[PDB]
Amino acid sequence: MTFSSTSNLKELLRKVVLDVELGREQVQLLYKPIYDSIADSNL
Amino acid sequence: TKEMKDFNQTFSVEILNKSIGESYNALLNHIHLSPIINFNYKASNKTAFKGETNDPIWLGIWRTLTQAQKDTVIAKRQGNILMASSADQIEIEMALNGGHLLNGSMYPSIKNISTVIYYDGWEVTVGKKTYSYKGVTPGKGYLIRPKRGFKELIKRDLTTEVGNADLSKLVENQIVGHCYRGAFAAVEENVQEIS
Amino acid sequence: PQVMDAKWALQGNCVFLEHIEGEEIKFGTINAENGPVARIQTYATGFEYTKEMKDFNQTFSVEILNKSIGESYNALLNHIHLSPIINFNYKASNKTAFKGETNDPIWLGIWRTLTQAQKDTVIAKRQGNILMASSADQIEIEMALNGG
Amino acid sequence: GFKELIKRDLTTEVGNADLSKLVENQIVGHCYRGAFAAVEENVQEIS
Amino acid sequence: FKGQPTPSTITQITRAKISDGKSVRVILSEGESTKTQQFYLINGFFGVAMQDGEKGDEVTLQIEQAEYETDNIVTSEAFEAGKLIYWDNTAKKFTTTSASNRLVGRVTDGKDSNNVIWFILLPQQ
Amino acid sequence: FKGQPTPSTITQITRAKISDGKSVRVILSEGESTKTQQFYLINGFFGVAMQDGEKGDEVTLQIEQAEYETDNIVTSEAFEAGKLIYWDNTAKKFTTTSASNRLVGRVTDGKDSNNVIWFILLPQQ
Amino acid sequence: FKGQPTPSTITQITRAKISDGKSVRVILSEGESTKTQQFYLINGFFGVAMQDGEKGDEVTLQ
């Protein structure tokens, strides 16, 4: 009795996820040391 | 749509918040730094590759760096922060660090550069289009005087608001993040470098 | 399992375009990033020897076959794990040329090429922390990694 | 970017033996293994 | 993600609705200038330009199909309530005559003494 | 009720608006199928099918007249900004040829390198 | 089974090999008979009948 018969029936076969690093890079505020900030809602 | 928020369990609002934060920060970098990159430098600011020599080590940008510092003290710019594409990081580090001996020429460490920065680009594919902020061009750098000729105007930092839903279609609130901001730059705070 | 299923995750996309006062805002999007898929194969080997050969060939015995199995086993282990590395049709990005090519060097000058690799593995974020090479170049690769 | 999967590292078994030919047990050793690898970890050096 | 450990296929969850479409951005050509809050036929779009824009500039038209007030009519033609209204780009004026003019709306308030009319902006046919 | 304890009269209050009409339900014919977030001319209604379907199935078309992003275009023709576009159902793609095709919008953003265009959807005349 | 609360779709996993195929099972015709352990061409199969087969009786070839 081949294992290939049970290949398609993924429900019967145990499922394990291939652990891997997924995501996207975190962006950062590079400018800040250069610029001097002035904050005022009325500009 | 509200169905998409409910049934698609992985989907939520937090992904939208994260993407808003990322795009927001990337555009802050763009608006603040793109004046530096895009500015049409004149001959007074540009400094050619003084480390040409003949068979110098690729830390010869050190030479090209040092002249630029002189080019700032002349005209009293006094550049203090370096910016350059991360591709040229290591060589710049080898210039900034105590670059090893070369034919007995113990080149000393360059000083009065408190900080270096690496503004590479930032690309994102939204839908069927791709929007990207150009980074520092490879093989270029900028000596910068800080905080005097550069001023950031912050009217509204970041305002995210939930807007016009449509109960007739069971569609959740449109979320919109908007900002009122600007930047002011100057030619009298920059010296360009090649490599 | 015979095949290990991939991971999945979601991200969003927005751009913050410049907003004229009369502008109608442009919406964002989402997308799904799916991990890779790995599968496990089967390897097997054996023998078929007549009992007469066992009986008379006094040199012959099972332990020779056990040693041969061990040798073939570890050889298959290292080959299956590393032959993807060697056989890969590397593109131009991963091919760091021989930067010891500066004329009249000392052959610890392969150091230069290694430095180029340490540069190229840091231009791209793929910082390579271990090296592999044919043992024929073990001397120079030592001299490069030491104080030449 | 490199991962080794080991389901059955190594099993050796003794099996069929045609007594009509006076043949000893067939011996078979086998393993269940897989390797995941990528181009996102490697740089090809020359010399 | 650059320099990720492993390849990973990006699946774009396609969506269509880029924007609500109330207002459309356009770029003015070498013979086109816009004053704020006026009607200009730019790139086949007819709407209320919301920005002062000289040639080569970037200006936003409003095409919300709401009710609009205007005064740029041709005074000779009597605009009665309900009559279809077209845009004559040669003279840059509204007009009741169809001819080759571009249909833009339908008049709600007839021509008053001051040649003002209120209409509703029809879609971009 | 039915077994009402007292005779009574029921008076109706007529009202014509039933829904905003932004989305139309349609039933797929035999020669029709729909993919999520794609344009289809079903029964004279052109819109973005929001659910996958097959023969004899029921789906929802969005006809909001907003701005939509798409690339299913005859790439030979140049879709400059502002040009009218017609759905050719035989080829099942946007064109600028008209002929017997169905006028389905006007382009806001011209054809970029990837043959992607942003266009406003006309209201199904 | 019969008292099933839920409809169930059966998933029949196939396997072509059914038996080793050493012994082919045949039926004795009217004009044919077999003895124990003897060669017979029954229904195009040549083999050693191992049951004394009468007409219409059953046997086991090899």
XYZ file of C-alpha atoms in Angstrom:
745
model
C 0.000 0.000 0.000
C 1.788 3.075 -1.299
C 2.107 6.288 0.666
C 1.513 8.101 -2.640
C -2.161 7.151 -2.385
C -2.456 9.273 0.770
C -0.355 12.107 -0.688
C -3.271 14.169 -1.989
C -5.359 13.838 1.191
C -3.450 16.539 3.041
C -6.037 16.450 5.829
C -5.017 12.918 6.792
C -1.303 13.719 6.717
C 0.040 15.668 9.678
C 0.753 19.330 8.913
C 3.903 21.114 10.100
C 4.851 24.653 9.099
C 8.382 25.307 7.856
C 9.506 27.890 10.399
C 11.142 30.869 8.704
C 11.655 34.611 9.150
C 8.846 36.529 7.424
C 8.252 40.241 7.782
C 9.455 43.595 6.521
C 12.207 45.912 7.692
C 11.441 48.570 10.281
C 11.922 52.095 8.950
C 13.792 54.621 11.097
C 13.992 58.402 11.379
C 17.495 59.158 10.119
C 17.019 62.896 9.601
C 16.550 63.936 13.212
C 20.137 64.798 14.289
C 20.520 67.027 11.227
C 17.305 69.020 11.521
C 16.227 71.280 14.364
C 12.497 70.915 14.944
C 10.010 73.688 15.674
C 6.485 72.522 16.497
C 3.536 74.908 16.353
C 0.003 74.123 15.222
C -0.467 77.688 13.933
C 2.223 77.730 11.242
C -15.292 45.616 4.247
C -16.621 44.464 7.607
C -16.693 40.862 6.391
C -12.985 41.166 5.621
C -12.293 42.431 9.134
C -14.406 39.698 10.742
C -13.812 36.446 8.859
C -10.231 37.034 7.734
C -8.835 36.591 11.225
C -5.216 37.350 10.329
C -6.332 40.692 8.917
C -6.965 43.413 11.480
C -6.471 47.139 11.993
C -2.955 46.689 13.392
C -1.498 45.797 9.991
C -2.916 49.036 8.611
C -1.492 50.952 11.574
C 1.931 49.382 11.049
C 1.935 50.202 7.344
C 0.809 53.749 8.099
C 3.705 54.111 10.522
C 6.211 52.710 8.045
C 5.061 54.885 5.143
C 4.936 57.886 7.469
C 8.511 57.402 8.645
C 9.759 56.756 5.120
C 8.191 59.972 3.883
C 9.658 61.886 6.820
C 13.066 60.660 5.697
C 12.226 61.588 2.107
C 11.058 65.147 2.761
C 13.887 65.854 5.181
C 16.775 64.435 3.145
C 15.742 64.647 -0.525
C 16.619 68.381 -0.626
C 20.200 67.379 0.146
C 20.403 64.717 -2.559
C 18.452 66.545 -5.249
C 20.129 69.935 -4.761
C 22.130 71.102 -7.777
C 25.523 71.495 -6.140
C 27.875 74.136 -7.518
C 31.630 73.876 -7.979
C 32.294 75.516 -4.608
C 30.754 72.592 -2.711
C 31.724 69.603 -4.864
C 35.017 67.883 -4.034
C 36.491 65.553 -6.639
C 38.063 62.192 -5.806
C 41.327 63.385 -4.287
C 42.264 59.814 -3.391
C 42.834 58.906 -7.049
C 46.621 58.597 -6.663
C 47.572 55.326 -8.419
C 46.923 51.958 -6.792
C 45.645 53.280 -3.451
C 43.603 51.139 -1.109
C 39.853 51.735 -1.337
C 40.149 53.509 2.011
C 41.714 56.225 -0.184
C 38.325 57.904 0.154
C 39.964 58.910 3.452
C 42.079 61.304 1.386
C 38.978 62.429 -0.490
C 37.272 62.801 2.876
C 40.003 64.862 4.518
C 40.164 67.459 1.743
C 36.404 67.868 2.062
C 36.842 68.715 5.738
C 39.385 71.335 4.707
C 36.913 72.532 2.086
C 34.443 73.139 4.911
C 36.857 75.006 7.183
C 37.630 77.185 4.212
C 34.361 79.151 3.969
C 33.755 78.156 7.621
C 31.041 75.582 6.865
C 32.610 73.180 9.399
C 30.837 69.985 8.419
C 30.211 67.646 11.345
C 27.846 64.815 10.277
C 28.447 62.486 7.333
C 25.782 60.941 5.103
C 26.414 58.259 2.517
C 24.774 55.277 0.858
C 25.289 52.140 2.919
C 27.114 50.466 0.018
C 30.065 52.761 0.749
C 29.747 52.198 4.506
C 32.733 49.907 5.065
C 35.236 52.014 3.143
C 33.930 55.083 4.961
C 34.364 53.171 8.207
C 37.887 52.232 7.139
C 38.486 55.932 6.556
C 36.856 56.948 9.829
C 38.630 54.220 11.773
C 42.390 53.898 12.099
C 42.959 52.631 8.561
C 45.863 50.209 8.600
C 49.391 50.965 7.447
C 50.055 51.325 3.719
C 53.652 51.445 2.468
C 54.510 52.659 5.961
C 52.033 55.562 5.683
C 50.226 55.444 9.039
C 47.267 57.532 7.966
C 45.616 58.894 11.148
C 41.964 58.612 12.070
C 39.715 61.370 10.761
C 38.054 63.296 13.591
C 35.301 65.879 14.065
C 32.748 63.546 12.489
C 30.498 62.786 15.447
C 27.945 60.776 13.463
C 27.546 59.047 10.120
C 24.189 58.135 8.591
C 23.126 55.811 5.778
C 19.971 56.839 3.917
C 19.394 54.054 1.464
C 16.190 54.190 -0.523
C 12.824 52.841 0.504
C 10.514 51.035 -1.909
C 6.984 49.733 -1.449
C 4.644 48.026 -3.896
C 1.085 49.224 -3.301
C -1.489 47.448 -5.425
C -0.317 47.371 -9.020
C 2.150 50.258 -8.623
C 5.550 50.735 -6.996
C 6.491 53.890 -5.085
C 10.085 54.406 -3.994
C 12.138 57.114 -2.312
C 15.632 57.254 -3.776
C 18.472 56.696 -1.346
C 21.892 58.263 -1.376
C 23.456 57.605 -4.759
C 26.257 55.022 -4.419
C 29.673 56.578 -4.724
C 28.613 59.860 -3.135
C 28.590 61.428 0.302
C 27.674 64.616 2.129
C 29.341 66.510 4.962
C 26.636 68.378 6.858
C 26.617 71.183 9.408
C 23.806 70.359 11.859
C 20.735 72.257 13.002
C 21.704 75.790 11.886
C 20.637 75.994 8.239
C 18.285 72.998 8.566
C 14.896 73.613 10.191
C 11.902 71.279 10.404
C 8.421 72.808 10.566
C 5.949 70.521 12.369
C 2.389 71.860 12.168
C 0.552 68.545 12.698
C 2.674 65.516 13.520
C 0.337 62.710 12.468
C -3.455 62.567 12.656
C -5.175 59.270 11.879
C -8.964 59.456 11.769
C -11.730 56.986 10.995
C -13.965 58.515 8.357
C -16.991 57.891 6.173
C -18.227 54.336 6.487
C -21.174 53.121 4.413
C -23.763 51.063 6.263
C -25.550 50.489 2.950
C -22.609 48.217 2.008
C -21.453 47.079 5.487
C -18.076 48.708 4.790
C -16.029 49.756 7.797
C -14.770 53.279 8.414
C -12.289 54.632 5.922
C -9.085 55.303 7.865
C -7.030 58.297 6.741
C -3.744 59.504 8.205
C -2.678 63.034 7.300
C 0.120 65.394 8.273
C 1.023 69.084 7.995
C 4.824 69.288 7.799
C 7.666 70.996 5.979
C 11.424 71.343 5.883
C 13.905 74.132 5.163
C 17.410 73.334 3.886
C 20.422 75.305 2.679
C 23.449 75.159 0.385
C 25.631 76.780 3.060
C 25.630 73.578 5.167
C 26.723 70.928 2.631
C 29.880 69.657 0.984
C 29.536 66.890 -1.594
C 32.025 64.040 -1.902
C 32.634 61.467 -4.624
C 33.226 57.930 -3.351
C 5.786 15.036 7.036
C 6.962 14.163 3.556
C 6.524 17.860 2.700
C 6.548 20.660 5.283
C 3.982 23.374 4.656
C 4.900 27.031 4.243
C 4.322 29.947 6.595
C 2.065 32.903 5.797
C 1.856 36.529 6.889
C 0.171 39.785 5.865
C 1.436 43.311 5.240
C -0.040 46.617 4.122
C 1.072 49.243 1.624
C 0.530 53.011 1.697
C 2.579 55.911 0.380
C 1.448 59.302 1.834
C 1.251 61.155 -1.451
C 1.316 64.945 -1.437
C -2.210 66.196 -0.739
C -3.556 69.192 -2.584
C -6.474 70.646 -0.608
C -8.914 69.477 -3.285
C -7.152 66.133 -3.739
C -9.044 62.873 -3.328
C -6.930 60.564 -1.192
C -5.521 57.390 -2.753
C -6.080 54.209 -0.764
C -3.567 51.549 0.215
C -3.478 47.793 -0.248
C -2.542 44.559 1.507
C -0.543 41.539 0.408
C 0.411 38.094 1.668
C 3.962 36.793 2.051
C 4.214 32.993 2.047
C 7.179 31.050 3.324
C 9.068 28.378 1.404
C 8.303 24.663 1.127
C 10.685 21.905 2.237
C 10.442 18.173 1.585
C 12.316 15.125 2.861
C 13.490 12.329 0.572
C 14.510 8.713 1.175
C 17.902 7.160 0.492
C 18.743 3.480 0.756
C 21.455 0.989 -0.129
C 22.222 -2.659 0.394
C 24.005 -5.842 -0.594
C 23.248 -9.358 -1.829
C 25.937 -11.915 -0.990
C 25.817 -15.697 -1.227
C 26.340 -17.731 1.936
C 29.184 -19.620 0.235
C 31.178 -16.388 0.064
C 30.619 -15.894 3.787
C 31.576 -19.480 4.557
C 34.830 -19.802 2.615
C 36.124 -16.241 2.123
C 37.495 -15.975 5.656
C 38.435 -12.342 5.033
C 34.791 -11.498 4.324
C 32.450 -10.663 7.192
C 29.583 -8.322 7.990
C 31.711 -5.664 9.704
C 33.293 -4.722 6.376
C 29.792 -4.063 5.104
C 29.033 -2.048 8.250
C 32.121 0.096 7.677
C 31.139 0.595 4.039
C 27.648 1.626 5.136
C 29.138 4.117 7.593
C 31.432 5.614 4.964
C 28.688 5.851 2.343
C 26.337 7.259 4.985
C 28.512 10.149 6.128
C 29.591 10.830 2.547
C 25.935 11.051 1.533
C 25.211 13.303 4.515
C 27.835 15.880 3.639
C 27.133 15.609 -0.091
C 23.377 16.073 0.214
C 23.802 19.000 2.584
C 26.603 20.840 0.765
C 26.230 19.951 -2.937
C 23.445 22.557 -3.255
C 26.097 25.111 -2.297
C 28.690 23.891 -4.788
C 26.374 23.111 -7.688
C 24.372 26.344 -7.517
C 24.383 28.390 -10.717
C 25.382 31.557 -8.903
C 24.415 34.823 -10.555
C 26.704 37.835 -10.863
C 25.630 39.148 -7.452
C 27.236 36.337 -5.450
C 30.416 36.101 -7.568
C 33.101 38.184 -5.870
C 36.056 38.177 -8.246
C 39.701 37.607 -7.301
C 40.720 40.954 -5.810
C 44.242 39.719 -5.147
C 44.787 40.361 -8.869
C 47.003 43.374 -8.101
C 50.275 42.524 -9.784
C 53.299 41.207 -7.899
C 51.466 40.451 -4.620
C 52.179 37.853 -1.965
C 49.753 34.949 -2.161
C 48.291 35.898 1.187
C 46.819 38.654 -1.055
C 43.787 36.426 -1.536
C 43.052 38.264 1.729
C 41.989 41.151 -0.519
C 39.393 38.947 -2.203
C 38.203 37.790 1.217
C 37.869 41.422 2.266
C 35.864 42.052 -0.900
C 33.619 39.179 0.137
C 33.291 40.677 3.609
C 32.369 43.890 1.816
C 29.928 42.226 -0.571
C 28.313 40.245 2.243
C 27.738 43.563 4.047
C 26.656 45.679 1.069
C 23.878 43.158 0.898
C 22.755 42.272 4.399
C 23.743 38.603 3.983
C 26.740 38.746 6.323
C 28.647 35.487 5.927
C 30.053 34.299 9.249
C 31.682 31.023 8.081
C 33.882 30.068 5.116
C 34.166 26.925 3.004
C 36.845 26.049 0.487
C 38.866 23.258 -1.043
C 41.687 22.241 1.271
C 44.200 23.002 -1.501
C 43.840 26.692 -0.577
C 44.034 26.048 3.169
C 47.405 27.777 3.559
C 46.544 31.127 1.987
C 43.069 31.203 3.533
C 44.840 30.736 6.850
C 47.351 33.488 6.046
C 44.538 35.804 4.982
C 42.668 35.067 8.207
C 45.846 35.590 10.254
C 48.147 38.591 10.399
C 49.731 38.218 6.961
C 18.622 29.922 5.249
C 19.899 26.380 5.841
C 17.800 23.717 7.562
C 18.266 19.965 7.951
C 15.227 17.723 8.413
C 15.785 14.264 9.921
C 12.783 11.925 9.998
C 14.691 8.627 10.275
C 18.454 9.099 10.436
C 19.545 5.530 9.674
C 18.006 2.079 10.009
C 19.727 -1.094 8.812
C 17.759 -4.333 8.566
C 18.357 -7.919 7.463
C 15.714 -9.384 5.177
C 14.995 -11.914 2.467
C 17.061 -15.091 2.117
C 16.261 -17.611 -0.620
C 17.088 -20.845 1.177
C 16.674 -22.626 -2.162
C 19.853 -20.794 -3.255
C 21.560 -20.871 0.184
C 21.782 -17.062 0.128
C 22.238 -15.053 3.315
C 19.939 -12.242 4.416
C 19.859 -9.174 2.225
C 21.009 -6.175 4.273
C 19.528 -2.751 3.545
C 20.331 0.528 5.281
C 18.146 3.554 4.658
C 17.442 7.090 5.850
C 14.697 9.706 5.646
C 16.245 13.164 5.372
C 15.863 16.507 3.660
C 17.836 19.702 3.212
C 16.609 23.252 2.635
C 19.136 25.738 1.273
C 19.144 29.046 -0.563
C 21.189 31.613 -2.477
C 20.424 34.208 0.223
C 23.365 33.068 2.385
C 26.371 32.599 0.083
C 29.021 34.435 -1.920
C 31.235 32.599 -4.418
C 34.902 33.499 -4.014
C 37.634 32.766 -6.548
C 41.070 31.903 -5.163
C 12.627 42.622 2.529
C 16.268 42.755 1.424
C 18.710 40.152 2.671
C 16.013 37.914 4.118
C 17.194 34.387 5.042
C 14.968 32.597 2.510
C 13.003 33.433 -0.636
C 9.317 34.094 -0.094
C 6.735 34.665 -2.807
C 4.769 37.908 -2.517
C 1.036 37.440 -3.144
C -0.695 40.719 -3.967
C -4.261 40.829 -2.662
C -5.577 42.768 -5.633
C -8.054 45.568 -4.969
C -9.685 47.962 -7.420
C -10.930 50.998 -5.490
C -7.885 53.273 -5.633
C -9.853 56.386 -4.634
C -13.384 57.702 -4.207
C -13.025 59.635 -7.460
C -14.694 62.855 -6.345
C -11.687 64.885 -7.558
C -9.134 64.141 -10.278
C -5.623 65.557 -10.479
C -4.287 66.859 -13.797
C -1.261 68.703 -15.192
C -1.696 71.866 -17.231
C -0.260 72.094 -20.735
C 1.564 75.059 -22.272
C -1.665 76.878 -23.221
C -3.693 76.291 -20.053
C -3.961 78.401 -16.902
C -6.432 78.070 -14.037
C -7.816 80.426 -11.424
C -9.169 78.991 -8.200
C -12.787 77.815 -8.276
C -13.536 77.961 -11.983
C -14.460 75.563 -14.760
C -11.735 74.401 -17.151
C -11.769 71.491 -19.612
C -8.382 69.910 -18.892
C -7.443 66.526 -20.370
C -11.050 65.734 -21.189
C -12.057 66.403 -17.563
C -14.563 69.166 -16.828
C -14.750 70.314 -13.234
C -14.066 72.994 -10.664
C -10.317 73.562 -10.546
C -9.521 73.984 -6.865
C -6.028 75.498 -7.295
C -4.536 78.500 -9.025
C -2.352 76.893 -11.670
C -0.166 78.346 -14.394
C 1.120 76.418 -17.406
C 3.074 73.317 -16.452
C 1.552 73.221 -12.956
C -0.483 70.518 -11.198
C -4.140 71.292 -10.482
C -7.037 69.345 -8.973
C -10.436 69.309 -10.684
C -13.611 68.570 -8.720
C -16.085 66.301 -10.525
C -18.327 65.396 -7.585
C -21.509 65.695 -9.738
C -23.083 67.895 -7.070
C -24.916 71.166 -7.695
C -22.705 73.958 -9.022
C -23.112 77.721 -9.323
C -21.599 79.480 -12.319
C -21.662 82.728 -14.272
C -19.595 81.929 -17.385
C -22.612 81.499 -19.677
C -23.097 83.094 -23.071
C -25.547 85.883 -22.323
C -27.443 85.709 -25.625
C -28.694 82.167 -25.028
C -31.549 81.998 -22.516
C -30.843 79.233 -19.998
C -34.166 77.823 -18.812
C -34.459 75.410 -15.915
C -33.910 71.823 -17.017
C -32.271 72.554 -20.366
C -29.130 70.584 -21.114
C -25.923 72.608 -20.891
C -22.704 72.108 -22.863
C -19.199 73.560 -22.709
C -17.727 75.374 -25.718
C -13.972 75.132 -25.318
C -13.242 77.466 -28.236
C -14.891 80.372 -26.409
C -14.426 78.697 -22.993
C -18.055 79.242 -21.990
C -21.224 77.352 -21.197
C -23.884 77.202 -23.894
C -27.241 75.554 -24.490
C -26.421 74.699 -28.111
C -25.003 71.201 -28.509
C -23.080 71.443 -31.801
C -19.711 69.780 -31.058
C -19.698 71.198 -27.525
C -19.152 68.848 -24.603
C -22.228 68.010 -22.533
C -21.555 68.955 -18.897
C -24.752 69.169 -16.842
C -28.381 70.183 -16.485
C -29.572 73.611 -15.350
C -31.595 73.825 -12.134
C -32.075 77.616 -11.961
C -32.737 79.638 -15.075
C -30.749 82.622 -16.255
C -31.334 85.347 -13.672
C -30.673 89.035 -14.321
C -26.974 88.686 -13.456
C -26.472 85.762 -15.900
C -25.881 83.401 -12.960
C -27.097 79.804 -13.227
C -27.220 76.782 -10.939
C -26.851 73.389 -12.589
C -25.769 69.846 -11.761
C -22.577 68.439 -13.229
C -23.272 65.403 -15.396
C -20.747 62.532 -15.540
C -17.734 62.531 -17.863
C -19.428 61.274 -21.011
C -52.630 38.738 12.853
C -54.864 36.170 11.184
C -57.136 35.570 14.173
C -57.423 39.274 14.845
C -59.519 40.134 17.940
C -60.883 43.295 16.266
C -61.495 44.307 12.634
C -58.986 46.863 11.421
C -57.548 48.478 8.304
C -53.882 48.517 7.288
C -52.514 51.588 5.505
C -49.295 51.478 3.494
C -46.610 54.160 3.270
C -45.045 54.081 -0.182
C -41.357 54.870 -0.598
C -39.254 54.191 -3.680
C -35.653 54.244 -2.441
C -34.683 50.778 -1.191
C -30.886 50.969 -1.213
C -28.054 53.262 -2.248
C -27.529 51.341 -5.488
C -23.753 51.223 -5.128
C -23.647 47.426 -5.595
C -25.824 45.287 -7.871
C -26.494 41.594 -7.405
C -26.311 39.524 -10.593
C -26.720 35.862 -11.520
C -24.039 34.365 -13.745
C -25.128 32.878 -17.061
C -23.602 29.721 -18.529
C -20.826 31.445 -20.474
C -19.804 33.633 -17.525
C -17.522 33.359 -14.507
C -16.049 35.906 -12.109
C -12.817 36.353 -10.182
C -12.462 38.454 -7.052
C -11.827 42.146 -7.750
C -12.064 42.071 -11.540
C -14.205 43.819 -14.128
C -17.074 42.009 -15.852
C -19.992 43.068 -18.054
C -22.789 40.886 -16.673
C -26.327 41.463 -17.949
C -25.527 44.988 -19.087
C -24.035 45.900 -15.683
C -20.308 46.649 -15.786
C -18.447 46.551 -12.510
C -15.932 45.006 -10.163
C -17.139 41.570 -9.102
C -16.509 41.334 -5.360
C -17.015 37.544 -5.130
C -15.814 34.585 -7.164
C -18.575 32.789 -9.039
C -19.444 30.290 -11.751
C -22.353 29.252 -13.971
C -25.738 30.029 -12.467
C -24.133 31.506 -9.341
C -24.845 34.888 -7.738
C -22.246 37.646 -7.273
C -22.019 41.353 -6.427
C -20.766 44.035 -8.828
C -19.548 47.343 -7.417
C -20.630 50.252 -9.640
C -19.649 53.087 -7.308
C -18.279 55.309 -10.135
C -15.137 55.824 -8.050
C -11.561 55.678 -9.343
C -10.352 52.145 -10.070
C -6.901 50.727 -10.787
C -6.545 48.140 -13.533
C -4.341 46.846 -16.336
C -6.579 44.525 -18.370
C -6.007 46.679 -21.450
C -5.104 46.150 -25.076
C -1.463 47.093 -24.578
C -0.960 48.162 -28.200
C -3.200 51.194 -27.709
C -1.811 54.037 -25.603
C -4.086 54.944 -22.680
C -3.121 58.557 -22.131
C -4.712 60.382 -19.221
C -8.208 61.656 -19.938
C -9.016 59.398 -22.889
C -12.309 57.516 -22.918
C -12.201 53.731 -22.583
C -14.544 50.996 -23.745
C -14.870 47.436 -22.484
C -14.568 44.991 -25.381
C -16.346 41.883 -24.147
C -15.217 39.692 -27.048
C -11.618 40.267 -25.955
C -12.672 41.035 -22.350
C -10.351 44.041 -22.095
C -10.305 47.828 -22.053
C -9.675 49.564 -25.373
C -10.012 53.002 -26.914
C -11.561 51.762 -30.169
C -15.261 52.155 -29.301
C -16.996 50.515 -32.306
C -19.637 48.337 -30.548
C -17.739 48.245 -27.242
C -19.283 49.519 -24.008
C -18.166 52.964 -22.817
C -17.017 52.240 -19.253
C -14.926 55.181 -18.078
C -12.316 57.862 -18.575
C -8.659 57.468 -17.662
C -7.256 59.612 -14.863
C -3.647 58.366 -14.869
C -2.034 57.501 -18.178
C -0.555 54.174 -19.190
C 2.607 53.629 -17.172
C 5.336 51.118 -18.038
C 3.406 48.191 -16.535
C 0.237 48.990 -18.544
C -1.482 50.006 -15.285
C -4.055 52.804 -15.492
C -6.294 54.587 -13.008
C -9.691 55.495 -14.423
C -13.084 56.708 -13.236
C -16.041 54.447 -13.994
C -18.869 56.099 -15.906
C -22.455 55.451 -14.687
C -23.476 52.779 -17.183
C -25.231 54.763 -19.906
C -22.977 3.247 8.104
C -26.772 3.315 7.855
C -27.611 5.515 10.844
C -25.266 8.286 9.762
C -26.197 11.749 11.120
C -24.184 13.489 8.379
C -23.786 12.749 4.655
C -20.272 11.434 4.037
C -18.284 11.322 0.803
C -16.182 8.165 0.647
C -12.509 8.481 -0.339
C -11.432 5.231 -1.997
C -7.641 4.967 -1.993
C -6.640 2.691 -4.853
C -4.088 -0.101 -4.966
C -3.624 -2.099 -8.154
C -1.718 -5.051 -6.719
C -4.224 -7.437 -5.152
C -2.422 -10.775 -4.782
C 0.990 -12.270 -5.476
C -0.358 -13.945 -8.617
C 1.218 -17.358 -8.036
C -2.071 -19.311 -8.161
C -4.725 -18.435 -10.754
C -8.270 -19.515 -9.864
C -10.323 -21.164 -12.634
C -13.623 -22.990 -13.249
C -13.834 -26.491 -14.744
C -15.882 -26.703 -17.940
C -18.112 -29.643 -18.854
C -15.601 -31.617 -20.908
C -12.695 -31.027 -18.514
C -11.541 -32.686 -15.302
C -8.366 -32.463 -13.229
C -6.418 -34.608 -10.782
C -4.243 -33.607 -7.850
C -0.886 -32.071 -8.773
C -0.987 -32.278 -12.559
C -0.514 -30.011 -15.558
C -3.660 -28.697 -17.245
C -4.500 -25.958 -19.754
C -7.619 -24.538 -18.090
C -9.037 -21.376 -19.675
C -5.783 -20.546 -21.415
C -3.835 -20.929 -18.144
C -1.228 -23.694 -17.992
C -0.323 -24.828 -14.507
C -0.314 -27.504 -11.848
C -3.869 -28.161 -10.721
C -3.704 -28.970 -6.999
C -7.306 -30.127 -6.453
C -9.000 -33.096 -8.095
C -11.312 -31.105 -10.336
C -14.606 -32.469 -11.583
C -16.585 -30.715 -14.299
C -18.057 -27.513 -12.929
C -15.941 -28.011 -9.789
C -13.225 -25.649 -8.495
C -9.415 -26.049 -8.514
C -6.207 -24.087 -7.779
C -3.630 -23.808 -10.558
C -0.023 -22.728 -10.013
